[model samples]
Target: WTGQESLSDSDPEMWELLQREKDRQCRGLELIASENFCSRAALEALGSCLNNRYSEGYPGKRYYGGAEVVDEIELLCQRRALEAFDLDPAQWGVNVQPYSGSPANLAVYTALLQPHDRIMGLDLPDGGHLTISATSIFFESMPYKLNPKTGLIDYNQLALTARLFRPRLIIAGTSAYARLIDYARMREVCDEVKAHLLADMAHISGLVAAKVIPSPFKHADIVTTTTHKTLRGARSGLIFYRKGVKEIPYTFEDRINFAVFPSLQGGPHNHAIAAVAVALKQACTPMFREYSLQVLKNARAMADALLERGYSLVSGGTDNHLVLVDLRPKGLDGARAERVLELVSITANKNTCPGDRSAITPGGLRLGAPALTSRQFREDDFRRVVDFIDEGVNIGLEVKSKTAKLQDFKSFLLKDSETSQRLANLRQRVEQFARAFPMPGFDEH
Candidate 1:
């Protein structure tokens, strides 16, 4: 039969490789702010036969025949998307066709603004994202200011900048910044400048859905989020645009759907849509809110652990799920710190701090407790993670003291350094510790 064999039977090599990655994930601590252990139910929907064909139109009106089931899945997805967030269908509409976050963001821009329309957002080095202004080329990006000393947004300065630039759209969100955004103040500024407020809350979707954090839907004219991060679903994105009347009455339904479909994407990924729907429905359950609140609690504990060791976290600590650490106090750069930590099998990411100029070899590391919390890691369990991080950075600093060149330092780490043994020891301890917790998506329990 053409489609009857098991994965291992059809492709043993690829299956073995997949097992390797699965083993890596099980053995390591995933501390990246944007990563999560998605559920098996979502994965099943993503791996289903719904991906076999194209459905080029909305539910019940597909351009192709044999898309009846695809239509059902997508329509159900859209319904659950709104319901998970508790958004009244009469007040807002969502587009689930975006293949990824960047594309979703671009479509929102295409649907709303013209070329040279002034748009304002936090600078990329300050936690804002690309595709916001096409990098000030196709359109003008009036980048806002953050407090250089404190690593916090300077709202007073933002109002002044908005008034001066008269930006057509103002984005309120962050990729690595940990503090909660004040959407009310953002709405006030947008009103003053007659700008549309786009809240890119992709990083905090689960927290918002759980009502553990402020909902941008209340104040944002447009909201964009990815389902895979905290939502723990497929790799897909969604756009929620205002529907009813406002100071600037919205007519985003037709324009946004057209922008997402014809202007930007072709057939929707029905499999991903189904998976997103599964995750959205899962989010509506009471346990999701408890998980969301525990994420916050563990995040604070993790931040406190980092701070107790004299590490400088941006904004001092986290109010939500992520913490940005300025590595200057450790006498190390984020690039080397991440590398050394990887030697210990702990996965964190390099990120920019408020005043950092170099993105490639940046001075900061971004950490999150979301994925570990998803494994039910209590606040106390995070203490050993802090220990591993502390020891790893200390080793990195010691290695750096012996060599100035990155190549030399890496060779020392890989080839003949005594610190490598120490790293190996840490990795063993980490594996044993991590294996104690159940990985939600894997069959390890």
Candidate 2:
């Protein structure tokens, strides 16, 4: 029996909510940088009966029974993962476990660093993930900053900091920053400090697979990435590391595998792995390469349009699929701007800018091209989006002046007939444009 019938019969409320969410996706625009809509093939694999299995270890060596077909599924996933990035099996070891990106990084850290060992990563406000969580609390984190003046990563400062700190691990990557990193230079700095370099290419995995951007494997001792973001898969994590390196004392393959199994997590999510295999296969295609290139083109065009409209962008522009816009120039806070945009059916997130004191009411909005691109939004479509954003910001500023807080502004906007009507008109236009771009997996035509 299809689950939808049971869901509707058993839980009408939840079924209604699911339908509303589907409607939301169909009607609204998603600008969240870390989010994307996967293909129907991936969704099918994720929702398959593979979830019923309990594979506690890698392929060919599992603690659970009934492992014959399960082993094949996992091995295919591992092989496709390597092929997706064109990595050599002899030199690289790929781990398809660890559940998601953060846990994957945690497993790597557990394998490499001792408690209280000094480590360097990008600053949280500068687009780095938080390293002070329960998974990494034992390690001392020394964060490196971006150049406030240029809104770019200051590599000279990073090298100097590495030289001074002498950290055991140095992480390279960002969640929000919008420029390409020189992984080769980062490797040099790591060499000087005798550090292990980890490149978290979670945000740019698709571009790397498409060969549109530089791969981190050339310089990083290890690489971690989420399968979804640009890779266009189910939500999952993967780790790629060098094997049989003479310079390291322990074999990275053994250590990482041990860390993932007995140390951190147990049992792999076979469903996610199957879906990831489908995504990796898709990533190896010529069409995926075109999609990756268009992601960049759309971002650059959007950046240019936003700049022409006098909006300040971090790093001046983007080298990948995302753009970070500083909303302070227009006398608007990111929190209010995000809400205002939502009123017009455009979705984006509030992000902290360099020198921003508070994360709650940050001064910037993080916009991405991936989801829009997935909906076939070209550069011209994004230019039109910029116009809607400009109008939204103007409305946000007007609302902010009359109200004390963002909540009050929201209340006022909902009650004010003229403002509500204006938003409805804008939302209608957005919906009309959105309907033209058929969402993958959901749209039949």
Candidate 3:
């Protein structure tokens, strides 16, 4: 039965390979800002057989038969989301349907505004996302620039733009920028112009979930987010709306759900929905509160550590889980830094700073504490990590030296056997350190 009957029988080789990858990650530090380690329960839900189900409609109203169990699962997710946001059922409505963040955003746009409707959002390269923010992508719509100095939205300019362009939707949020948002001001701006306010809190869902930061639920007409990233759920999208505004004329929730169901996506991904529900439940617990606070603390500490090591951080510091380092002052391109860091297994992405002059592939380096925090790395450990990065950069700088033996170091890192040995050694050291502060349910794995 266990013979090479590939369709039903398990493949030992593939299973071992997958387990090897798990073991590998269990040792390395994951510092990517837009990533995190989901709980084992979340992972289990995502890997469940619920993926076999083809749920094509909302609870009790299915386009397909045999949706009874699937309906309960989705209903549970919907109710938990509603409760998490503390939505009053009389005032707000929930939709657990969008396939992903961009589609969810498009659904919001389709539900609320007409095509070519004027919309205002932060510029893409300045930390705004493409869904509701990219200028070249959303050029038919209006694009607003944030204050280059403060990394905050320019309210005066936004007000002026709204008056001139008369955008129907004012969007707020970012992917790379590290700072707190003033949703109150955004709400005020929308009210002044009688426009709809859409808050895309994809980057700060965990913070909002744990009350680490203020929730935009009450302030914005609609909120959209990816369940992963800071939320630490499955890779999926979510769209939720506040209660009072849905009563006005258009059934907002119905439009959003319908758009996601029949218009955009086909069968709902039941496995991801189950995983999201598990993540949401985990986020509501006290441990998640501590994790959220630690995310900010570790980010701030890492920024300080980098600054102390003579690296230039954009905006000088951070208030959230990400920090953007402007490598121009050091005469280093982000691409080179990224490559050098990757050699050491420290993963980070190149990002554009506010008013960046460099190209996308070689601009600034974006660092954050989310994945590192998920690995249970704290302030002191971040100090060490920063030093490691500084040392790597220093090694690169010494590569051009006439008298120094930079080639020897480079050879060690580049050699296949040497690099593998070094990675194994470094992984052991990291394991010793990380084992001190264990991530629940993942330590033994």
Which structure among the candidates has the greatest TM-score?
Answer: 1
Model 2: per-residue lDDT, tens digit, 1-445?
A: 6655676688889888988877787788888765788999998989889998888877877756887787998889888989989998888879998799998989889989888898888877334212146334879888888887888878999999888988998889887889888999999999988999999898899999999889899889999999989888999999899876566643788889999998999888999989999999999999999999999999899899999989999878888888999888878877788888988888888877777654347788889988888889899999998888888888888788888977788898899887888888888988887867778774421
Give each model a TM-score: 0.95, 0.94, 0.86
True lDDT of residue 251, candidate 2: 72
lDDT of 2 at 88: 85
Off by over 4 Å in 2: 1-6, 125-131, 245-250, 443-445
Error (Å) of candidate 3 at residue 55 is: 1.2
Error of 1 at 162 (Å): 1.8
Give the Å shift of residue 254 in candidate 1. 0.7
Model 3 per-residue lDDT at 318:
91
Off by over 4 Å in 3: 1-9, 12-17, 125-139, 245-250, 358-362, 400-445
Model 3 root-mean-square deviation: 4.3
Whole-model Cα lDDT of every candidate shown, in order: 0.85, 0.85, 0.74
lDDT of 1 by residue, 1-445 (tens): 7888988889989988988888888889889766899899998888889888688868766665788878777888989999999999989899899998878888888888887788888877334211123647667887786788877888989998788889888989887888998899999999988988999988899999999998999899899999988888889999998787866767988888989988889999988999899999999999999999999999899999988999998888988888888897678887788788888889987776677664346778888888899898999888779999998998888899888898888888888658778889889998899988888774731
lDDT of 3 by residue, 222-322 (tens): 88988889888888888887655433654677777777877778888999999999988888788988989999999899999888878887778898888
